[model samples]
Target chain A: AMKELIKVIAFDADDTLWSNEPFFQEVEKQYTDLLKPYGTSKEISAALFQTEMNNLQILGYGAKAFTISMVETALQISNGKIAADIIRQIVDLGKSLLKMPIELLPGVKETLKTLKETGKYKLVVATKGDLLDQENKLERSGLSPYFDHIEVMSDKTEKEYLRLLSILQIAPSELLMVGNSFKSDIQPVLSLGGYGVHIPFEVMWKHETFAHERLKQVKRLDDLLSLLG
Target chain B: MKELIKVIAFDADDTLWSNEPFFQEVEKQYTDLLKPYGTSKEISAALFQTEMNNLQILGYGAKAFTISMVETALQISNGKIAADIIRQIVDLGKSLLKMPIELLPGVKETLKTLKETGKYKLVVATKGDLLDQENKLERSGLSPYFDHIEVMSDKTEKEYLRLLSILQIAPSELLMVGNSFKSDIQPVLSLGGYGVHIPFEETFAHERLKQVKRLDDLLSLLG
Candidate 1:
């Protein structure tokens, strides 16, 4: 017995809608591997995490910092013995990742098309990051035509979700959120009394990923097309 | 003997100023202690570098961001571990660091007296995390005295050199004063501009420290 959804269908851009975690995981592997000589994976991961924490004051978030972290970790682990060429490679890799465009998940286009045909749902793409970067991603994804409204926010707080719904002139119960992240999409929406459908992605971005008991309210789906059923 | 100059330029904020490095260093130490499970210094250093790079993009100061990074790092490293204690510790640290603005000695009076004489051109040139740098300049009681203010930005050598061309001044006429040997002084010096280097107390935060000649005091260059 599935409940009827209406008005809004919000999507998470990074992982739920496309491939993002793999890139980060790849970088993380490179980072850990580079530091293997100094300590165990656990030790290196913790130390790298601390350094990153120290850095966030300056770097903020995103692949650029992640890449820089990789190079920095390597140099520190090797006690500055790591070759300059290797450090340069890490920087180059970071630049490439930042420049790389949004890669939409498979079945994204068809799923959006199906959702749009329903006419009952006013599709809104709610993604977070550098505003310009997110806007560029939406334009390139070929799914921009499907969404009536787009939200490129720095964060998806409960207040933000509530405000967004108010601005859209919609009720909480009438809106349905569909995305990969439980923290950014599900919890925020649920707190506002809106329905949230969670589609778990394999890897969540380090910042957006969070754990809370409230996530149980979110209906987990295997794919975007699942919303059709 | 050094040549006499018509103008004495100074880099604002971290150069002709006291800045966030001391706070950053303290935070790094705390992060290293808390994340004993990880590689500590190496991991912390990498993260710090990433933070610096990111700030250049956002152009904001380090306070709020430093707090966020600390919280984020703890979450990433500790995973499911309760981060309540760590979060509180970071918040406390941020409060202490944010208390009072530290102004470098002689900066205010130096600029005022230089402007009063009206004989020498007084300029403030600096590159920073954008808005943070600008905000710092505005807040400092010394913004009004400068005959010229330049924030060069993250650009190529040609773009930077173009500043001299746009100002309609020769390289020798322009004296670059900065704490960063790499980014501030050397680049200007390379273009044939006279550079006055004021070495920062902690060079690690400069990120580009290997490039320029060092000097002890601004008065030494007076003649």
Candidate 2:
């Protein structure tokens, strides 16, 4: 059951509308298998996260750079003992993930259609990462038709969100953010006086997850259509 | 011997005094141990470089980057064993951290002398984790000295050139001083600005080997 939110509603693309974790999880398994010889999974995972965090500048954000990092870490763990072919596989997998079609989560289209029919919420898509890639995905998914506006940004910091709110010409309290990431979506929106609905995903992207303490003034939702009621 | 320029620009943090590299070294060690499963050092190094490049987009600061590095490392490593190591790595970053306000030897005296001349427009130009750098500058009692302080969002070629254009000063008229070869000297030099490289002891050691005209000390600028 949900109360009627006014003015604006924004949605996160990747996991909010469809399955994104499985692809990333699959890649994570590959990295784990490759690095398992050098250290425990925990240690290896920590190192990978460190590397990706370090490379935020070069890689930006997305599956492609993430995949390359996996290969790079694998090669490092093996001290170059890991075959070049395996490294190639990691790279190929990352590129493939980028081009992979949108996998809509069960009931996403139905929920979006229902919300669109109501026409009460001004639908905006606030997704982060490479602009072109996100734009292309929205185009391919046929989800673009439903959204009145789309924002594809590099990162969603407080300033960026404020700017977004300014451009939209909406009061902060009147807007609602619906997304999977606590770091980029929930906390930032909540901090700005907007309400945020967190839809917990099975596997959170490393960069998108934050400490629980950071999140404030956000409401959590388990199902997609639940917000409508 | 570095030539004395009309303006003496100083890099805060490690250049003005102690900062950054110690935390980096600790993090490096943590990655080395924690990422033992992967091609640890090389991968870690490349990743670090990428993080540095993305500084503009990510915003300047270490805590966020440090947290990100820890999380990304966890994601890549894939398996699990001990939570203590992860905790220790984060703790190390917190412990090694300090504001970049330490005044280098003779920095105050030389700046005072240079200010008295009334012939120079002294400026402080620095890049890196912004909050820490700004806090350090404010605490060191040095913020009042500079005529202008520029904390850049990005140090790309275009951005650097834009700064010069906006200042309405020819590149030759501006003497840029800093510790980092990547962000400071090269960008300034490429834009035709005179650059004085002051090598800081106990800073990012990897940067030491990079080619630049070094000064024996900051006091030399006063002469």
Candidate 3:
């Protein structure tokens, strides 16, 4: 059934091609320590979640927004008088979060190496996050040269896909997207009348919580070449 | 001068800070790059239309402006542009994103003087892309001086009225200070609010129709 109406073969960067969310959780856990004096880890997470949601409009998204929110939570928990030394530590922690190494999952290099050999596709990496860090990760992936194009999105929504579609001058029916999250990756593409393939990682940042289990819209991937070929 | 004006809200982009100049600079560069497609006038007209078309989607800011530039390029060239030019446009956008927030002359001194009076609540009512607006405000280091900071979606009479209603102030009790007559002055004036224009030196096409209020200088007002 897949005769390749797709002009561009898109991959969602963070979790789909590489080991992404684990590193974020690593930073988040340490952040949990910094906020522990304010409350327990769970409570701090809820507060930080609320804080991040608030600042998303103000500061946009990603590590910058997270850093600003963390600093704000520090001020809030400390009654606007958080110690200067402690504030510096948290701020430094956020800086450190920016430049960490990028390590792809085992099959990524192998899979893409083989995929390119097919020579039937124009590869694209459509990532949703910080523009600065997105470049770093793509450069680190060593799979950078293989991709025909790269996009850094503020968030992955239908509107965002429409933005990409406008830039590409390609219709929805011309795209085939592969990614980790249904919300960010799959559903959006499907809504636009595009073809989307869902590939699972360890779990995504949002779906790691398993916040929903009610329905089924996607199937899984194992022994991938059999499906693609 | 002080009559009926219980609250004075400053416009963020051009009124109290440098904004339009940078847009003009970007427009100049865009027009320069686009000479093959048509005349400078034609290219500028196309760019203006592109931005207006994208306003519903990109909202407004350097980011929105940059997107419009890219779209304009695609149109003028009919998909024949060199890739490096795309790089240049993107670099210009990123540079604008990181551009330092500079206050217009007499902004803070005026704000500080008004704050010292203790007679009115100071606020910033600016229309811009929310993300860009907030970042500039945070960078301004002047947040502590204002009781309200509203980054509006658009500058129109209804939005202005909505803002006034939220602040629990009558239109008669409000004074709006700004640089764009079409954006900041006309709507508020029609809403029965007092308006003060800082009389921008270089005017964009959008500001052409407004009757140049020429509020001149805020410090002049303070004196």
Candidate 4:
């Protein structure tokens, strides 16, 4: 019954669509190494995490925000003694995320192709981040053709999903959101009576990880085919 | 025949509200902090170049501008800039995000007029960080006037074409009113849509296209 009712399949961009967290982890190692003089990798990451959480509301999400928070963390960890050259390196390190190649997750193309071929639902990328960054990533991913469009939200809140629904001109029941983060993707949509398929990424940010009960789960993007198609 | 404009899209920063002056003010403070490194002109020029360099990667808005300022400071001071001053620069950039929304003269009244008439679907088409633009629109008390906000990555013909598709309207059925000719007016006009230019100042000397003195003048254009 739900298969016939859903009209749009909204996919979350980061982690869900491609290999994201691995690159982030790769960068984090380098970042912690850069600040190793001040703190251990664990300590540096903890401090940076605190700063990102603090700046989440003011700066929001994206490489720029992450870079700024990294700089702040360096300043704090070094107690105003962090050298300027190292600060430049940290900024570059964060900006590198934007330039990193978009590696489509296993079976992403096949899955999108399958869903798109069905012609039973409208496909769109529903993500949260800097406006241009998300758009560029999609364009670079070469998967833009499958999606009707991208909805780059500031945050994945109930209100934002509602806005998306309004823009798509569909009722909440017609949306089937597939994403990696439960807090960001699944919970919000499930709250709105829309369906969500949780595809948890191997790596997750600390803030994004939380426990939830009785949620549908999938091992990978291609797994969605049998469940929906 | 001219009544075909179904959607009236307004630019957010420096068009519907005050924005640039605050950035300028912060830039002054930033330059002052780097006074020991070089002249204000030298520092400002270098900062502008850094912004241009980072525009593609960082995109736009307070966060990008702040990072640019920090990078410029590091370079301008030849790595001699103190961490305290760097912290101050970051603070200045953060303040820009929360600046008071000052609606342009007659903007409120004009929007009220348009909304009350209910003849057109109004929207705010702007370029910047999604959260920052959305927050500003909500704070401006103009959200209710418009149907929704569209925070475009860039204001180009391609973006406008996407805007047209989103609104489900044809080119002739859209009217965009904004302050910038290049970013706001020209692109929409290129898409065969109407553009009403509202100059924030007598800046930008391009071949003069039709422009209005204030937001209220848009009423006459529509009529």
Ranking by lDDT: 4, 3, 2, 1
Candidate 4, position B139, lDDT: 90
Number of the predicted model whose DockQ against the real structure is largest: 4
lDDT by residue (tens digit), candidate 3, A30-73? 87887787889888788888878865654576665566567666
Q: Please, what are the lDDT tens digits per residue for candidate 4 over residues A14-119? A: 9999878888888999999999999899999999999999998778887788989999899888999988888888888988998989988888999998888888
lDDT of each: 0.58, 0.61, 0.68, 0.87
Cα miss at B27, model 1 (Å)? 25
Model 4 clash tally, residue pairs: 0
Interface RMSD of 3: 19.1
Candidate no. 4 TM-score:
0.92
Error of 4 at A178 (Å): 0.9
DockQ for each candidate? 0.02, 0.02, 0.05, 0.70
CA lDDT of A136 in candidate 1?
54
In angstroms, how far off is A189's CA in candidate 3?
0.3
RMSD in order of candidates:
16.1, 13.2, 19.8, 3.1
**lDDT of each residue in B1-223, candidate 1, tens digit only:** 1343455566775665676576566566656655745566656665566566655333323443443354345444543323343444445444433434566766667667667767666666654333344445656766688754544434235535655653456666667677766666666666666666666662232222223333334544454
Q: What TM-score should be assigned to candidate 3? A: 0.51
Sort by TM-score, best first. Answer: 4, 3, 2, 1
Per-residue lDDT for A175-219 in model 2, tens only?
778887777878888887787777766555557544443232332
Tens digits of per-residue lDDT for model 1, A1-229: 2246456777777876777778766766666676677888888888778777775643435554465455456656667665544554555565555556667776678778888887867788776544334545677778778887665443578866765676466788777787877778888887777776676765544576454422333323335455446
- Model 2, B13: alpha-carbon shift in Å? 30
For model 4, the docking class works out as medium
